[model samples]
Target: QSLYERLSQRMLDISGDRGVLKDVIREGAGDLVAPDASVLVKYSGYLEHMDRPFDSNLMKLEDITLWGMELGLLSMRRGELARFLFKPNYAYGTLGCPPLIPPNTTVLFEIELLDFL
Candidate 1:
């Protein structure tokens, strides 16, 4: 079957099962999320050379970190992730960098997104 059709059918089937409500299929199939949620987003370093990558760049974000706003935010929860669906203006604030990032730039950030509504 087609990708959409398969995904749609899968979602329908899972939504009907209580056990499946906690998580959804990954790879855009469905989001297995709940009022209790935490996602760790790890940023990798983009290399400027030969489209390579820089290793050993990492950071752990504390839950109490005061956050900044994404230039064009799509949604927001009281104390959790601020969704920036298609806009990334406020991504790396105030950097005198090119719009399309060049190679060899290292970024290390891991965010623990917690949701328990």
Candidate 2:
């Protein structure tokens, strides 16, 4: 199958289900993100399916530590605005964050890169 077909099928299969996906809402004109780079961003996180807001903040790359989130950030350029979709394992895992997040849940985050060091 073609890459486009495979991805299209995957999107359909994972609709409303925990899936790894990303959409760049706005392109940036700045430095590319690197593993060792520190960046400043404003972000909002929402529970998948439910679309409930869980968290929001302005923090550093290392401070906002979620393996999946960090991976998403790597693809971003300074000043970019992007939304990322992550599955359970990349999120809170089998045991999600209490009160705010539940177990085996998916989540989406929209981040705006403000600055970098």
Candidate 3:
């Protein structure tokens, strides 16, 4: 009976600018994302940029951090900032880094939840 399950991917097929509808969704999600409550946003950074294989060149800096920041902002209502997990591991849900990894590379994360003291 969780709203997250019911609402996650609720807009995948949505194709249009429905401001009203979007606002409603935002409100509901905001409630779920508690103040100072931690939440995990899993991601796979397999998308290559500039065809330089930058993704596989071993990088851990502002690029990834910026992505997390923007994603957090979009879903800002969810909670406070927590440490992000990044790494290439096997048997992680699905492992398929297109154009690279030549085999498998699924980047995963687990946002350890903790409240501000």
Candidate 4:
């Protein structure tokens, strides 16, 4: 089975019918993240079929570029760890990041919310 199909079978459809999916790896403590809040996170971005992440960061949430990631983070709490699957429209759209991600590709992110303010 394709990765997309397998993921579709497993993850929650957080975006309703819009295609952003989530799987929580670890439960978090405290309140949910605020939409305008700045957060510290440890994350990795991966494309399908790759063993290694194309990008990784231990940085503030405002620097993240993917729309899906921003939305996913807002649903999380401090100390939470989750994996999010993003379809093209919520990801890089039809013009994905070059040299790593291709156009219209699906991406996965493993993010840990360390803290938020």
Candidate 5:
């Protein structure tokens, strides 16, 4: 099966057909994160077909560059952990970051929302 078909069976379609999918790993308490809020998160990013993550961070949400990641974070509440699948358009696009990500690659992110204000 194709990546989209396989993941679609298990993940929620968060971005219509624009290819941002999500799977909740753990439920969180409190309100959903606000658009203007700042959040602390722990996350790791992996390219499809790779065994290990290409990047990991324990950082503030405002520093994230991926559109899919930002969308996923806004959907979570404090203490939630989730996995998101991002098609290239929502990720790095056709010109992915060099030295780590390749062009037009699908990526995955495991993210935990630690807190928000």
Candidate 6:
């Protein structure tokens, strides 16, 4: 299966009707992320409906407030590579991230956990 297909299928397998799905594309080398822990990662985000990029961790970033995103990150293990699918509600909401992301858009993020702090 294509990486997209694999990721999509894996996500579907976990969240049936839920909007957010965490698909682990690769296993991490060290510990699992703590619920309250902060993580360092490099990521690329894209609109699920588009081929181009959106926002990402590669840009200057910090403390995550988006609940769905934070929920997904809580599962990250150090050094792991994963993909997270976020629905409009779990993302920037109907208003979107502005300029970069459109309102109510589904976003896909490929993330590699670099460290925990």
* TM-score for each candidate, following the candidate numbering: 0.24, 0.75, 0.21, 0.89, 0.87, 0.74
Model 3 — TM-score against the truth? Answer: 0.21
Q: Compared with the true structure, what per-residue lDDT tens digits does model 5 show for residues 3-99?
A: 6447657688889984889999999998998886788889999876678989888345557467898888888999999999898889988998886
Badly placed stretches (over 4 Å) of model 4 are: 58-64
Q: Model 4: which residue pairs collide?
A: none
**Which portions of model 1 miss their true places by more than 4 Å?**
1-28, 32-36, 40-50, 54-88, 96-117
Residue 10 of model 4 has an lDDT of 69
Worst 10 residues of 3 by lDDT: 14-23
Candidate 3 C-alpha lDDT tens digits along 1-117:
333223332332111321101112222222434333333443323222233323321122233343332333233333333222122322222353454443433232223212111
Off-target runs (Cα >4 Å) in candidate 3 are 1-30, 50-117
Compose the digit string of candidate 6's lDDT tens values, residues 1-117.
644445666473234556778778788876777777767778888775567776655212255466566766667778888878777888888998777788987677788888887
**True lDDT of residue 86, candidate 4:** 90
* Model 4: per-residue Cα lDDT over 5-63, one tens digit each: 68767687778875689999998998998877888899999888689998888345557
Best by lDDT: 4
Residue pair clashes in candidate 3: 33-78
Which segments of candidate 5 are over 4 A away from where they belong?
2-5, 58-64
Q: Please give the distance, in angstroms, between residue 85's alpha carbon in candidate 5 and its true position after superposition.
A: 0.3
Better of 2 and 6 by TM-score: 2
Going through the candidates in the order shown, the clash numbers are 7, 0, 1, 0, 0, 0
lDDT for model 5 comes to 0.84
lDDT of 4 at 45: 91
Selected candidate, larger lDDT, 3 vs 6: 6
